[PDB]
């Protein structure tokens, strides 16, 4: 059971668990955050922009709109994991168990020992406390869980406000009516489907034309014969030609009619 | 799961009413913010503030539409505020510390006055002495009454508002209601066909660009008719897009009504 | 689900009787509203004042229509109020504090006179000493009788009201029921095919507008014949639309009975 | 119950379990690491590269860019086993229970004996501890499990950075845009799967061409009869021809056009 | 089968100088039986035998035999190892074997309460639980050290094999004159030829059986599918023993005119 | 059930149970050995071969290898039953219970009575022993059961080697390459299946003619008429011709071509 | 084959019946010189009876009698008698043997038998304690399991030693029948004039002819009866199948009485001038 593997087990110890809780929640967020950048294609072409120029010709301000998109899109993974842990509250209570002031404790009279304070409070999350302090143990358990949930509900509130400000300003300051942007956002996600689809077909066709010249024939299934028959290949596309359809693109217009993707710009020569 | 969003009452003085505010206000706020974004009637309104850059249009025409934005998006917070009030757990945890010890009933003068607020704080969590359980049960019902009381009357004031808004809407709209019904069926019919054509006119332009690169575009059996039946030569000008976005209030043309800016653009 | 919509008595004097009114009347009140909104007869009756703004129609001709509208929507208030009265939950919670202790019998005088109302208020919540269980039981059984007695005669009131009105409606109306059955069927049938024609005529105009913008419209197979079958040129003017909505009471034209304003408009 | 056999059994004995901790975690890691190298086709054409030249003229500049890929595509398997063990915590606690400082125990007063501290601490993972020290064990067990679970999470972080570091350099230092590399990635697999598929068929046709000469006829299934009727062969492929499509290929452009596989380089006749 | 498993299951005889004999038999012999099965099923061992039979002069040197002999054991020594390893990891076999060899003074967890009257006898009784209750702590102590010593060796044995397999695989590719890719085709050819051979041998067997029965009974009875076999695959006679004698024997890549021959049969198909 | 009846029941009695153990093991082995000989077809033509010559015309040496095949094929059942009994150990303990030397007994101080050594040692397997010597009954049982399992494992080992030894020499000493034996074996199995299949068809057709000749007709199922029409009988086959295709057969060549059975030799004319 | 399954069901049938018999109805009469006779009858009587239904139900048995009564000279050759006698026993005499062995194997049948013969002085593990007058009587009560606990010690050894004898005796019986079957099969093939392939073909033919004979005979009865119905009514009503038979099977008539007698009895296996004849029925057709 992988649930038992990644389960949050609180090491009840002073000055030790908050260090653990920091690395038991932040690190999965870091992994989740890293995944978002890696998979999002909007960051490779941004990287690819930095490699071809080798000079830093392009200004930062035009690229900041796209730079905020990769971080923004990938920011769901940390938030949806930072929030879920906070609401569960197990992460926080084990983290902040040892900072509770014994003097400010409530629900009971001043019978809390002060010989070794942090040691007893640190052991609260694991329930390894004498029942004579069970009221104290429960009181801190509830109060600390309260701050987690209050922080958790605050966290989701802040994200919602940020999204509202982001989308409202993005539509306001963009120079295209939002209906056109929907068509544009229905293009880049449509071109990439066709471009990936023909990438294999013009690869497999080029694969068969290589094996055949070696073996003397090519094994194929019933469908693959249609690929060779319908779509013949003659050669390969030049490397600079590949260089002209990678990078970032920001609504460069031609003659008064838009070009929606950098490939479309190259399709006009 | 429901366990994560489940209401856990922190039985503490001057603290739980903060939590109830957050555990109810924020989910209400997050629903309301969701409502605005999804409702497409606000973006063109936002886009309306952009193209003019002058505010030529007065607020009076906008106000009739602006109500339809917040109101149509206010259903989600209301149905979430109601259930929380009807459930009652949030309210009792909210006002437990404000119960007057003097107004306590169903028992003799046995409730301690040493730390009333502290004792009153721990009522929602069953952290109470059995001797005070009668007091706890009394406030467990008196407080739950107010929540269920507030829930029902807040439902009623909402309910009459729907009737008041709808009747006034039919009272103030110059066109007859049955014609408005046709207008409602036209907005859905145009939006679907426009959206359905948005994908197709995107795909045809998509294939007409990949082909220039690879030399051929791989299409399945059904997408093949898309290229054959629907050929395009280019794109549409930005001003042309800029003339069919925004708000529209029943501009009549030579005795012929127009129902959408696109229709108004279709008449030239 | 059903847990949220339930009755829980606040065992408090001068407070529970408010809850009983709120916990039943308001759910009945909203159900009363809902019937009005769904019915289409209200808006045209509402729209009648809009097209005149002068009170052209007198009170006597228009008073006849008002009777039918309220009764149709009155189904929800009566289909719910009597059900709660059958359970008797509202009555026992509401008027328990107002039960006169003098009429209490079938037991010796044991109920305290210090707080008679307060003890009475806590009966529904099962909070009562076993010595007063007899006092609780007698009133609980008495209130359940009165609630059911009240609830049962409500059904009879409904039963007689529909019966007398139906013959009165037949007697008052100058039309035979066989004539009324056909006429009523016409409205219930002409509306349905009016709505279906509305969408088809809505889509056809919608398709034409998009084509003038994109250049081609992506329709399914069934929509393809829609363009071929029903091609339109423009729309219908607002006065033509206005001549449809409103109320109508069986005008006659040279011995030809007309059954709808549309039929009245059909002859020109 | 095959998983039950490989289950961890901590030998509670001083200076002994950490050896077992190593050899019951390292060895399956070593086995998983070796498997990654063996099954990875990119490691054989590396070996066959230095084999046929017999001189090692080529420098380390082209080798290191591939050698990392050999381990990288294979070193993931040991790590996803090394991290899993650390998260479970069983491997570490038994390994290091001997080294716990007898002066660093808390949650109890000075009740730890000093006669054989290492010995008594060694038996903590086996729960064979007298009930007068049950507080001590539940302190050491939970403390050591922290150290493991901290190391496991940290190790995941280091891979979570090395992958992102590598994926950036592999796209910033390579002379090809990523969209072209995806094609070059979609071509290496497209050719190899065709090659394996066509190798099997040209094997069977050659086989059926010899068995016939030994029996006068060949038994073939109904669908296999189509194979012989479609893909006739005339002989075998010479060894030097088989020796020019084995090895490492590094983006040799031809007359201004690219070649994506070493086979492709031979396909143009080079 | 719960009864069959119960028969083979280990039953340690707690007695000195006796159990490790059984432990040797209870693991060694099933390993030996598995190893013998590995030899017989390995088709490469027979044409190896047939090679040592037909030539009668030991024509082949050590190098042609050594390269093949490695494949004989490698494809067969897997079965003993995965049985020896599985036994060691279980640890029951080892603890029964060495229960009479731990040094009493090396024991711990208890003071010098270990009797020295007949040390070997009492130690040997540990695996079968047949121990006095006062030495139950010692019983568990030895029951764990010996489990360890088995388990460490069990894991160590797997590691050594996982090195030899990698070393053997790497050496073969570096030493053979063929490219690794051409060997894959060569491996993909022996399987196709063998499967076609065995399948087509049956058909040329049944036809000969059908032809001979017809001469005796006067006719032959065939199933629906066998009817096609007689017409589609007619035979005229048998094949001489020397013809059968040119295709059974180890073959190591004799190239012809610069074009390879991939098996004895292929060399015969060219009449060489 | 059947297993309950044939369940071993050790007769605890001196000088008597080892007789029972032999019969309760040997007889099941002897019976199973007979079934191996009886069902095997290569044993009857061996006997039938002696019928025709009646004078030992053929030498015993060439026919010896067949005798190696008949014993080897049949011996699987006795061994697989002898081994199972040895591994179970029930047979052996009751067989040798009363032969355990009291002097060599261990795991107990010398309380073993000598008044009836054999008798009390005979009763050990059947729980009819004093509880004061219960540890001995466990000690003697475990040592004896150890001896049984060692013999069982040694026996299966020797059978394992002999199977290999008789299969390494058979290929070596046979005059044919092992592949020819593959065809020869696949031919024999094909011949017998086809030969037996035609016998049913030939008989059913022949019986039809006799019944038709005597009722004037025959009652047939759906496929019988197909059998009658497709395969008509023209008579029977002489006995001496049948005799030429019975009996053992060694590989004999004709004009440089093999003949794989007497039926083949007969079919060649 | 078909023969083995036919025997197997019978072997299972008696074993189950023996298990059923040993539960509901077997109570050893613990009375001297009464259990001994009871024990012997508890084995032989089912054995002798079960052998009898084996003979009666065997069709080939009356074939032997028919020839013996017809020939009155025992002119049947040794080989056909070897075939039939080894056929009936192999098909019938199996059932008593299986009952006999399982009865011995369980031992409750035998333990009653020699309980009388048990020597009081042959007992061990203690001094012999039995009166010279009631020694036989007390032993007879051992199998009932009602013996006093004082005599339980001596009873278990006696009830087991006989149980030892029964299982050993039952096993020894299995050896004899197993050897005999092996001995007979060799004698059957050695003394037969034709090889086993001939014997296989012949016995395989015998089943097919008699199976064909039975099916035809039932049909011939129906068609002959139907034709006489037509003669007695002038019309016949038939279903789909039977009506096809009358149109497809002409009525040859009534066969001569000697012809029926010629096709019953033992088979002389006289080769028709070298051409084999596998039954009397085959000879009759080839004879004419």
Nearest to E213 by CA among D215, F224, F46, F245: F245
The partner residue sitting opposite A183, judged by closest CB among B19, B36, B198, is: B198
Quick check: A178 and B214 CB within 8 A?
A: no
Among all residues of chain E, which has the CA nearest to that of F255?
Answer: E240
Contacts 24+ apart (CB under 8 A), C95-98: C95/C17, C95/C143, C96/C16, C96/C120, C96/C121, C96/C123, C96/C124, C96/C139, C96/C143, C97/C13, C97/C14, C97/C16, C97/C17, C97/C121, C98/C17
Chains that touch A (3 or more CB pairs under 8 A): B, D
* Sign of the dihedral through C-alpha E105, E108, E114, E117: negative
Give the chain A residue nearest B53 (alpha carbons): A172
| Residues F163 and F156 sit within 8 Å (Cβ to Cβ) | no
Tokens representing D173?
């230092």
CB neighbour list of residue F202: distance below 8 Å, 6 or more residues apart: E217, E218, E219, F231, F233, G201
B89–chain A nearest CA distance, Å? 15
Please check whether residue B211 is in contact with residue B217, taking contact to mean a CB–CB distance below 8 angstroms.
yes
**F180: closest CA among D149, G196, E201, D92?**
E201
Tokens representing residue A121 in the block: 């409070």
Report the half-sphere exposure of D264 (CA within 13 A, side-chain side).
26
Rounded alpha-carbon distances, angstroms, from residue G76 to A241, F193, G202: 105, 35, 18
Helices (H), chain E: 2-8, 19-41, 44-54, 62-74, 78-90, 92-97, 119-124, 136-175, 180-217, 224-232, 241-245, 264-269
Nearest to A10, CA basis, from D152, D133, D145, D101: D145
Chain D hits for A34, Cβ within 8 Å: 160-161, 163-164
Interface test with C, best of B7, B134, B144, B152 (most C CBs within 10 A): B152
Report helix angle A17-39 to A76-88, nearest 10: 150
b/e burial code for range G240-265 (CB count within 10 A of at least 16 → b): eeeeebbeebeeeeeeeeeeeeebeb
Touch A-B: 3+ C-beta pairs under 8 A = yes
Are residues E25 and F138, on separate chains, in Cβ contact within 8 Å? no
Q: D-E interface: how many C-beta pairs under 8 angstroms?
A: 165
Q: Between A and B, how many residue pairs show a Cβ–Cβ distance under 8 A?
A: 160
Contact B182 C203 (CB under 8 A): no
Pairing of β B256-257 and β B252-253: antiparallel
Give the single-character DSSP code of D55: S
- Which pair of structure tokens corresponds to residue F177? 């390459």
Alpha carbons A231 and E256: distance in angstroms, whole number:
40
Question: B178-196 in b/e burial notation, b at 16+ Cβ within 10 A?
Answer: bbbbbbebbeebbeebbeb
Q: With CA atoms as reference, report the closest residue to C210 among A175, B230, B52.
A: B230
Contacts of E15 in chain F (CB under 8 A): 106, 142-143, 146
Count of B-C CB contacts under 8 Å:
158
For C151, the token pair is 């609830």
- Is the distance from CB of D39 to CB of D73 less than 8 angstroms? no
Nearest-CA distance from G73 to chain F in Å?
A: 28
Q: Classify residue D57 as exposed, middle or buried by CB count within 10 Å of its CB (0-12, 13-18, 19+).
A: exposed
Tokens 């040390």 label which residue? E119
Say which residues have a Cβ less than 8 Å from residue A217's Cβ, sequence separation at least 6. D198, D202, D230, D231
Q: Which two tokens stand for residue D76?
A: 């993931």
Judge: B193–C203 Cβ closer than 8 Å, yes or no.
yes
The two beta strands, C252-253 and B256-257, are unpaired
Is D38–E166 a contact, with Cβ atoms under 8 angstroms apart?
yes
Tokens 């437990």 sit at which residue?
B96
CB atoms within 10 A of CB D182: 16
Rounded CA separation G264/G281 (Å): 8
Q: Which residue stretches of chain D are H helix?
A: 2-5, 17-23, 26-39, 44-53, 61-88, 90-96, 117-122, 134-172, 178-215, 222-230, 239-243, 262-267
Distance CA B30, CA A161 (A): 8
Chain C partners (3+ C-beta pairs within 8 A): B
SS3 D169: helix
What is the distance between the alpha carbons of residues C25 and C84, in angstroms, rounded to a whole number?
Answer: 10
Task: Give which of E41, E35, E46, E90 is closest to E68, Cα–Cα.
Answer: E46
CA distance A172 to chain D (A): 32
* Helix H or strand E encompassing C238: helix C238-242
Partner-chain contact D210 E193, CB within 8 Å: yes
Of E157, E155, E181, E180, residue with least CA distance to E169? E180
d(CA A125, CA F190): 78
Hey, what are E165's tokens? 């397999």
Residue among D149, D163, D257 minimizing CB distance to A236: D257
Contacts of D246 in chain E (CB under 8 A): 179-182
Strand partners, A257: A254
Chain D nearest-CA distance from A66, in A, is 18
**Of A136, A173, A168, residue with least CA distance to A62:** A173
The Cα B195–Cα G93 span in angstroms is: 92
* Inter-chain CB proximity E53 and F172 less than 8 Å: yes
Q: Name the nearest CA neighbour of E246 among E47, E86, E111.
A: E47
| DSSP tag of E230 | H
C14: left (phi over 0), alpha (psi -120 to 50) or beta: left
How many Cβ atoms from other residues are within 10 Å of residue G74's Cβ?
Answer: 9
User: How far, in whole angstroms, is CA D151 from its chain's centroid?
Assistant: 21
D264 interaction partners in chain A (CB closer than 8 Å): 210
Q: List, as one string, the DSSP characters of C141-173.
A: HHHHHHHHHHHHHHHHHHHHHHHHHHHHHHHHS
Alpha-carbon span F18 to F12, nearest angstrom = 10
List C-alpha distances in Å: A126 to A12, C223, D67, D133: 6, 67, 48, 18
Q: Are C84 and C24 in contact (CB under 8 A)?
A: yes
The distance of Cα A51 from the centroid of its chain, to the nearest Å, equals 24
E strand or H helix at A32, and its extent? Answer: helix A17-39
User: What residues of A are in contact with residue B27 (Cβ under 8 Å)?
Assistant: 153
How distant is the Cα of E95 from the closest Cα of chain D, in angstroms? 14
| Full DSSP string of C173-225 | SSS-HHHHHHHHHHHHHHHHHHHHHHHHHHHHHHHHHHHHHHS-----HHHHH
CA distance to partner chain F, nearest, from residue E174 (Å): 33
Min distance C242 CA to chain B CA atoms (Å): 6
User: What approach was used to elucidate this structure?
Assistant: cryo-EM
Judging contacts by C-beta atoms under 8 Å, the chain E residues touching residue D31 are 158-159, 162
| CB-CB contact of E204 with D215 (8 Å) | yes
User: Which segments of D6-60 does DSSP mark as H helices, in order?
Assistant: 17-23, 26-39, 44-53
Helix (H) or strand (E) holding B178: helix B177-214
Q: Point out which residues pair with F259 in neighbouring strands.
A: F252
Degrees to nearest 5, angle at CA F256 with F253 and F258: 40
Rounded to a whole number of angstroms, the distance from the CA of F105 to the nearest CA of chain E is 11
Cβ contact F46:F66 at 8 Å: yes
Residues of A in Cβ contact (< 8 Å) with D176: 239, 242
Are the Cβ atoms of D245 and A128 closer than 8 angstroms?
Answer: no
**Residue C3, token pair as written in the block:** 């847990």
Mutation site for A-interface testing, chosen from B36, B126, B214 by largest number of A Cβ within 10 Å = B214
Q: Which two tokens stand for residue C266?
A: 């059909």
Q: How far apart are CA B139 and CA B146, in angstroms?
A: 10
Q: Which string of DSSP letters, residue by residue, matches chain F? A: -HHHHT-------TTTHHHHHHHHHHHHHHHHHHHHHHH-GGGHHHHHHHHHH-S--S-HHHHHHHHHHHHHHHTHHHHHHHHHHHHH-HHHHHHHGGG--STT--SS-S----TTHHHHHHSGGGT-S-GGGHHHHHHHHHHHHHHHHHHHHHHHHHHHHHHHHHHHHHHHHSSS-HHHHHHHHHHHHHHHHHHHHHHHHHHHHHHHHHHHHHHSS----TTHHHHHHHS-------HHHHHHT-S----EEETTEEE-SHHHHHHT-
């Amino acid at each position: 059971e992988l649930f038992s593997v990644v389960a949050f087990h609180c090491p009840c110890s002073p000055a030790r668990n908050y260090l653990y809780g920091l690395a038991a929640i932040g690190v999965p967020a870091l992994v989740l955050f890293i995944i978002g950048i890696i998979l999002n294609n909007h960051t490779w072409n941004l990287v690819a922009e930095c490699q071809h120029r080798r000079t830093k010709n392009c200004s930062a301000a035009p690229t900041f709109l796209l730079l905020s998109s990769i971080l923004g899109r990938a920011a769901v993974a940390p938030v949806t994991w930072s929030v879920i842990s906070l609401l569960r509250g197990e992460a926080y209570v084990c983290a902040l168990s040892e900072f509770v002031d014994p003097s400010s404790l409530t629900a009971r009279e001043e019978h809390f020992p002060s010989a070794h304070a942090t040691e007893i409070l640190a052991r609260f999350p694991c329930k390894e406390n004498p029942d004579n302090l069970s009221d104290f143990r429960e009181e801190v358990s509830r109060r600390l869980r309260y701050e987690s949930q209050l922080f958790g509900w605050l966290l989701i509130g802040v994200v919602a406000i940020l999204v509202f400000l982001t989308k409202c300003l993005k539509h306001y300051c963009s120079p295209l009516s939002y209906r056109q942007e929907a068509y544009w956002a229905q293009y880049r996600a449509n071109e990439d489907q066709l471009f990936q689809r023909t990438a294999e077909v013009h690869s497999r066709v080029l694969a068969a034309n290589n094996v055949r010249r070696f073996f003397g024939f090519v094994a194929l299934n019933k469908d693959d014969e249609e690929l060779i028959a319908n779509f013949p290949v003659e050669g390969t596309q030049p490397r600079p030609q590949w260089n002209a359809i990678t990078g970032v693109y920001l609504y460069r217009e031609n003659q008064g009619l838009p070009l929606y993707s950098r490939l479309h710009k190259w399709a006009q020569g």
